[PDB]
Amino acid sequence: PQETLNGGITDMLTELANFEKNVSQAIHKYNAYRKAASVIAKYPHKIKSGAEAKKLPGVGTKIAEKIDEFLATGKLRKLEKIRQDDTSSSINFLTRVSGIGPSAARKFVDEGIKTLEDLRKNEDKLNHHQRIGLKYFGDFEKRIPREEMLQMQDIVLNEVKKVDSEYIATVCGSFRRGAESSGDMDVLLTHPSFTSESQPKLLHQVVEQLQKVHFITDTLSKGETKFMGVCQLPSKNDEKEYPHRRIDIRLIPKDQYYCGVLYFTGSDIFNKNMRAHALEKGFTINEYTIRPLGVTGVAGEPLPVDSEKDIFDYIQWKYREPKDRSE
DNA sequence: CCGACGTCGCATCAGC
DNA sequence: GCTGATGCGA
DNA sequence: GTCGG
Ligand code: NA
Ligand code: NA
Structure with missing residues (x-):
C-alpha cells in the first residue's frame, strides 16, 4: 500500500485529528480520526467512494461523507477554513513544542504569543520543560x-x-x-x-x-x-x-x-492481540503483571515472570521475536 | 441512546 | 505548609 | 467520531 493510493485522504484525516487534539481538545475524536487514517493507509486499493471506505472498521458515517467531498472536489471546506484561521493554526502549531499542550498553546495565543519567535521573546512565561522543547524544537522533530x-x-x-x-x-x-x-x-x-x-x-x-x-x-x-x-x-x-x-x-x-x-516493545496492535488472546486463555495481561482470571472474573495474584518467554508460555503462545511483532 | 475510548509519573497549579 | 487537581507526555 | 451494550 503506497502513499499515492489514498494519501490525500489519510493526510486530510490526520490533519483533522491534530485540530481535534490541539484546538478542540477532544482527544477521543483525535484518536478516532487517527484510527480511520491508519485503516485506510493499510487499505490496498484506491478508494472510489465514502461508502467503500465505510466498510472499514473505524470509518463511520461522517468520515464517509468527508471522503465523498474530498474525492469530488479535492478538498474539505471545513479543513480549508481552519487552515487559514490564524488563531487555530497558531494553537495547533505551538503544540509541536514538547511541553506545550492544548491548554498552554491556547493561553499563549490568547495573549498574542503565536510563533517560535514569540516564544523566544517570552522565556519567563515558559516552564523548564517548555524551554527545552523550544531550544530543541527542530532536533526533536528529526x-x-x-x-x-x-x-x-x-x-x-x-x-x-x-x-x-x-x-x-x-x-x-x-x-x-x-x-x-x-x-x-x-x-x-x-x-x-x-x-x-x-x-x-x-x-x-x-x-x-x-x-x-x-x-x-x-x-x-x-x-x-x-x-x-x-x-x-x-x-x-x-x-x-x-x-x-x-x-x-x-x-x-x-x-x-x-x-x-x-x-514497551510493542507494537500497539500486537499488544492488543496478545491481550485479546490472553483473556481467551483466562489471563489478564497489562504493563506490570500477568494474572489468572478465576471463574467469575476475579483476578488472582500476579504470576512470576523471569523472562519474556515466560509470558508467552503462560498463555500457550509461541515466543515471537520483536522483529516479528508489528502485529 | 449513551458511555468507553490506557494509565500513571512528574511538574506545577488551585485550594486550604 | 500540605494535599489533591490538572497538564503533559508516552 | 465510531463502536457497541
Ligand atoms: Na464502519
Ligand atoms: Na507539545
Whole structure:
C-alpha cells in the first residue's frame, strides 16, 4: 500500500485529528480520526467512494461523507477554513513544542504569543520543560537513524554496567523490533535488589553517570522511577554535531520488568492481540503483571515472570521475536 | 441512546 | 505548609 | 467520531 493510493485522504484525516487534539481538545475524536487514517493507509486499493471506505472498521458515517467531498472536489471546506484561521493554526502549531499542550498553546495565543519567535521573546512565561522543547524544537522533530540508535545504545549499556554490573538495561520501542529509524530512545531499567515487595537511588546513579560522560544534556523531569530528558552522541572531531535526542529511562521492579519490556516493545496492535488472546486463555495481561482470571472474573495474584518467554508460555503462545511483532 | 475510548509519573497549579 | 487537581507526555 | 451494550 503506497502513499499515492489514498494519501490525500489519510493526510486530510490526520490533519483533522491534530485540530481535534490541539484546538478542540477532544482527544477521543483525535484518536478516532487517527484510527480511520491508519485503516485506510493499510487499505490496498484506491478508494472510489465514502461508502467503500465505510466498510472499514473505524470509518463511520461522517468520515464517509468527508471522503465523498474530498474525492469530488479535492478538498474539505471545513479543513480549508481552519487552515487559514490564524488563531487555530497558531494553537495547533505551538503544540509541536514538547511541553506545550492544548491548554498552554491556547493561553499563549490568547495573549498574542503565536510563533517560535514569540516564544523566544517570552522565556519567563515558559516552564523548564517548555524551554527545552523550544531550544530543541527542530532536533526533536528529526528521526533517529538506527545506526545512531546503536551508538546511543552502546553508551547506555556501557555506562549502566559501569555503575553496577548487576543492572539490567533494555532499549525498547520500535528499535527493539528492528526499525530502521526511531523517534526517541526508551530505556527500561532494573536491578535484582529492587522488587515490588521492597534503594531509592538506583535511577539517580545511572542518570548521573550518563551526565558525567556528557551523553545526557538536559532533564525534562526526574523522579525515583522515571527520567525524561535529552541526550547527544559525541561529535567526531571535524564532523557536524549530532542532533539532540529525546531519551526516557524508567526503573521497573525485577518482577515486573519483562511485562514492562514486552509492553514497551510493542507494537500497539500486537499488544492488543496478545491481550485479546490472553483473556481467551483466562489471563489478564497489562504493563506490570500477568494474572489468572478465576471463574467469575476475579483476578488472582500476579504470576512470576523471569523472562519474556515466560509470558508467552503462560498463555500457550509461541515466543515471537520483536522483529516479528508489528502485529 | 449513551458511555468507553490506557494509565500513571512528574511538574506545577488551585485550594486550604 | 500540605494535599489533591490538572497538564503533559508516552 | 465510531463502536457497541
Ligand atoms: Na464502519
Ligand atoms: Na507539545
